[PDB]
Design an enzyme around this catalytic site. Sequence first.
Site, PDB file in Angstrom:
ATOM      1  N   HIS A 255       0.929  -1.268   0.099  1.00 29.82           N
ATOM      2  CA  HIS A 255       0.161   0.185  -0.015  1.00 29.82           C
ATOM      3  C   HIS A 255       0.905   1.312   0.045  1.00 29.82           C
ATOM      4  O   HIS A 255       0.326   2.285  -0.113  1.00 29.82           O
ATOM      5  CB  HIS A 255      -1.199   0.036   1.112  1.00 29.82           C
ATOM      6  CG  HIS A 255      -0.534  -0.159   2.605  1.00 29.82           C
ATOM      7  ND1 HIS A 255       0.123   1.191   3.074  1.00 29.82           N
ATOM      8  CD2 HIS A 255      -1.053  -0.617   3.653  1.00 29.82           C
ATOM      9  CE1 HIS A 255       0.283   0.749   4.291  1.00 29.82           C
ATOM     10  NE2 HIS A 255      -0.365  -0.355   4.785  1.00 29.82           N
TER      11      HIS A 255
ATOM     12  N   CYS B 215       3.844   1.341   9.721  1.00 33.22           N
ATOM     13  CA  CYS B 215       3.518   0.219   8.749  1.00 33.22           C
ATOM     14  C   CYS B 215       4.923  -0.139   8.064  1.00 33.22           C
ATOM     15  O   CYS B 215       5.942   0.524   8.051  1.00 33.22           O
ATOM     16  CB  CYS B 215       2.713   0.519   7.567  1.00 33.22           C
ATOM     17  SG  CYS B 215       0.800   0.416   7.912  1.00 33.22           S
TER      18      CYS B 215
ATOM     19  N   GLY C 258       2.675   5.657  10.407  1.00 37.66           N
ATOM     20  CA  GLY C 258       3.840   5.576   9.831  1.00 37.66           C
ATOM     21  C   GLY C 258       4.656   4.118  10.323  1.00 37.66           C
ATOM     22  O   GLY C 258       5.823   3.976  10.021  1.00 37.66           O
TER      23      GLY C 258
HETATM   24  C1  LIG Z   1       0.513   1.279   8.988  1.00 39.29           C
HETATM   25  C2  LIG Z   1       0.330   2.840   8.936  1.00 39.29           C
HETATM   26  O1  LIG Z   1       1.416   3.548   9.259  1.00 39.29           O
HETATM   27  N1  LIG Z   1      -0.974   3.133   8.487  1.00 39.29           N
HETATM   28  C3  LIG Z   1      -2.047   2.316   8.271  1.00 39.29           C
HETATM   29  C4  LIG Z   1      -2.263   2.465   6.481  1.00 39.29           C
HETATM   30  N2  LIG Z   1      -2.534   4.122   6.261  1.00 39.29           N
HETATM   31  C5  LIG Z   1      -4.011   4.431   5.739  1.00 39.29           C
HETATM   32  N3  LIG Z   1      -4.444   5.694   5.973  1.00 39.29           N
HETATM   33  C6  LIG Z   1      -5.712   5.990   5.743  1.00 39.29           C
HETATM   34  N4  LIG Z   1      -6.226   7.348   5.810  1.00 39.29           N
HETATM   35  C7  LIG Z   1      -7.673   7.594   5.319  1.00 39.29           C
HETATM   36  N5  LIG Z   1      -6.690   5.120   5.313  1.00 39.29           N
HETATM   37  C8  LIG Z   1      -6.096   3.691   5.376  1.00 39.29           C
HETATM   38  N6  LIG Z   1      -7.009   2.622   4.925  1.00 39.29           N
HETATM   39  C9  LIG Z   1      -6.829   1.467   4.997  1.00 39.29           C
HETATM   40  C10 LIG Z   1      -7.921   0.425   5.215  1.00 39.29           C
HETATM   41  C11 LIG Z   1      -8.710   0.526   6.594  1.00 39.29           C
HETATM   42  O2  LIG Z   1     -10.055   0.079   5.909  1.00 39.29           O
HETATM   43  C12 LIG Z   1      -6.084   1.092   3.699  1.00 39.29           C
HETATM   44  C13 LIG Z   1      -6.790   1.998   2.471  1.00 39.29           C
HETATM   45  C14 LIG Z   1      -6.215   1.500   1.252  1.00 39.29           C
HETATM   46  C15 LIG Z   1      -5.219   0.868   1.259  1.00 39.29           C
HETATM   47  C16 LIG Z   1      -4.595   0.083   2.403  1.00 39.29           C
HETATM   48  C17 LIG Z   1      -5.027   0.516   3.526  1.00 39.29           C
HETATM   49 CL1  LIG Z   1      -4.308  -0.199   5.076  1.00 39.29          CL
HETATM   50  N7  LIG Z   1      -5.020   3.488   5.659  1.00 39.29           N
HETATM   51  C18 LIG Z   1      -1.764   5.008   7.107  1.00 39.29           C
HETATM   52  C19 LIG Z   1      -1.197   4.469   8.303  1.00 39.29           C
HETATM   53  C20 LIG Z   1      -2.173   4.200   9.673  1.00 39.29           C
HETATM   54  O3  LIG Z   1      -1.727   3.925  10.719  1.00 39.29           O
HETATM   55  N8  LIG Z   1      -3.781   4.570   9.513  1.00 39.29           N
HETATM   56  C21 LIG Z   1      -4.605   4.485  10.574  1.00 39.29           C
HETATM   57  C22 LIG Z   1      -5.801   3.739  10.230  1.00 39.29           C
HETATM   58  C23 LIG Z   1      -5.552   2.430   9.341  1.00 39.29           C
HETATM   59  N9  LIG Z   1      -6.912   1.831   8.741  1.00 39.29           N
HETATM   60  O4  LIG Z   1      -4.408   1.998   9.501  1.00 39.29           O
END
Ligand code: A1D70
EC number: 3.4.19.12
Lengths: 301, 301
Positions: free
Chosen positions: B41, B145, B143
């Site tokens: 991602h 991830c 961050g």
């Molecule tokens: C691991 C990390 O540092 N992350 C996780 C991924 N990322 C992020 N940001 C946002 N902002 C809207 N949305 C997502 N959505 C996830 C799906 C949840 O249903 C997503 C969407 C598309 C592709 C991949 C994914 Cl994982 N992800 C930023 C950051 C973080 O910790 N975000 C908090 C929320 C979360 N779902 O991780």
Amino acid sequence: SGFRKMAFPSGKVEGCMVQVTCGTTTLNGLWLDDVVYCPRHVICTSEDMLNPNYEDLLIRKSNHNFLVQAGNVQLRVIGHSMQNCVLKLKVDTANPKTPKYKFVRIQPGQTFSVLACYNGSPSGVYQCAMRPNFTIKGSFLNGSCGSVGFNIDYDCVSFCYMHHMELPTGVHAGTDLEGNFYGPFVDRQTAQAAGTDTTITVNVLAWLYAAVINGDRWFLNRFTTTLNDFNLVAMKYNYEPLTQDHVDILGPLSAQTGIAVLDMCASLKELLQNGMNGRTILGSALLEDEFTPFDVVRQCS
Amino acid sequence: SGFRKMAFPSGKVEGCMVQVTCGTTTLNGLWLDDVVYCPRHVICTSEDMLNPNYEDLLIRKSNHNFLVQAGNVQLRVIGHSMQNCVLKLKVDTANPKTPKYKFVRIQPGQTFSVLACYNGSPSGVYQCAMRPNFTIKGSFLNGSCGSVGFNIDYDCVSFCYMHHMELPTGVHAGTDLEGNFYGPFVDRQTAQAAGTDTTITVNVLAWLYAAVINGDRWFLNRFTTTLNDFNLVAMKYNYEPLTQDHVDILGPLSAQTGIAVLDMCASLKELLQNGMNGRTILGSALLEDEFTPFDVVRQCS
Ligand SMILES: *CC(=O)N1CCN(c2nc(NC)nc(N[C@@H](CCO)c3ccccc3Cl)n2)C[C@H]1C(=O)NCCC(N)=O
Ligand SMILES: *CC(=O)N1CCN(c2nc(NC)nc(N[C@@H](CCO)c3ccccc3Cl)n2)C[C@H]1C(=O)NCCC(N)=O
């Protein structure tokens, strides 16, 4: 999100761990520049544990009575000396893995990471707090002596603890890296025992702020309290007094959550008086006191 | 003596952590030999989070769209490829700090250490368990991830987890190092939520053995139980079934303490039915289920 007992990454300390053997006694040492530090009781003979005179024991030793092994490499000892309850073994090789470091003594209520080691080999890492009675509730087995406690700040390791013994209650005692014991414990056979302990109030309040930051809010209430009235409750429950400095140190967590410190104190008073009624905070059913305000800020959003 | 949530020393994994940037998205990667692994991602654009087609996103990229930094050194990407939900970035330099390693997928109920990292820099280490619903109760911020989970056995790092996301309840989801998710979670925007969880019964029994090894005995009783009768109680309290294999795995701890496994089960049944009456086990007022039988044996005498 989440809140764990988190230690500092241990790599910088792993590269400093060595094995020290004197006679048939083996324990761990800490190799920084060209010195290896370890508990002086490595020279104690099982014949006089009651009142060893370490000055005498050490004068009877030469450099070749100390076997120092760093991994599979033997380190030549070229000097030996005592500093308080620690031995300093000068070796002919500076440790090429020496980090930037300091020797710092910590206060009761402050936390640190412990790298438990056996035969100079690291086995695990965990977080510990210095209790108000200067013991630590560690996890150590036979041969763990010489394992160290430390904090890391921007690549500099501040060493604060070297392990020397287990007390009869199963808690642990040791020294700073200058060889000075935390607390009244001594490296000679005594019925030494941990003095009465108390709960670290400022840390419990920090942990309640962590819980609010992480969405546990059930224990909050509309009340406030005065510092004096809170401290009357603290004393009753074997909690340490909360000082105005503690209140000031909790200022950033207060500001971030919008909960005044004395408002959080009113919540803690209710938890002490009523219990938790079968609820949990941050996955615990008791009030946790081994996270400092710094620990909460470092870990939480 | 003592019993702590103990992680493996993290040094071997610290030397593998790097920073991967694509566009304005930065996260962590894992550098082993001449490959850097990270969540795919990192190539997702905030414009289509709903159904990214990652095959399309990746075909539109070249090697120069990936910035990889190991400390202060930039690593030249010479190949890129996807494997399930992980990206593999081939770089022109083999990591000289690569440990002996394996990629292993773990079972629900097994534990591992997590090295939380930000911008390729390690920040802390803690122990976690894979829950029965394939989430982990981690401690991660934005961050994080690409931070990994691992176990170490005789100098070999078995990597088992790479972090991908936080779920709405604050628990965490990710993949094995082949890019295959633990559980039903997906790297696309959904109201995905952790399915119902249960308590890991064999681990609670291991932890009661740890407590007996460490001198907490108050919860023992003269009773025994049959496996079938215990499992009827387990089901009522949202505990996983105890299998005969679990009983066999607990054999060494049984033998060391002299307490038959089904005798310990009778104690657990009484704790489930009566609670702890204001007492604690190993410093906890709830029944702990994130220590495996192996964890207890490694840590305890
Ligand atoms: C691991 C990390 O540092 N992350 C996780 C991924 N990322 C992020 N940001 C946002 N902002 C809207 N949305 C997502 N959505 C996830 C799906 C949840 O249903 C997503 C969407 C598309 C592709 C991949 C994914 Cl994982 N992800 C930023 C950051 C973080 O910790 N975000 C908090 C929320 C979360 N779902 O991780
Ligand atoms: C750190 C370590 O690996 N230790 C601790 C020190 N050592 C040990 N063994 C024994 N066997 C009888 N006795 C002691 N006595 C302590 C004093 C306690 O009052 C002692 C005596 C003389 C000089 C120094 C000391 Cl610390 N120490 C072996 C080993 C260990 O963990 N032992 C368990 C008990 C303990 N007191 O540490």
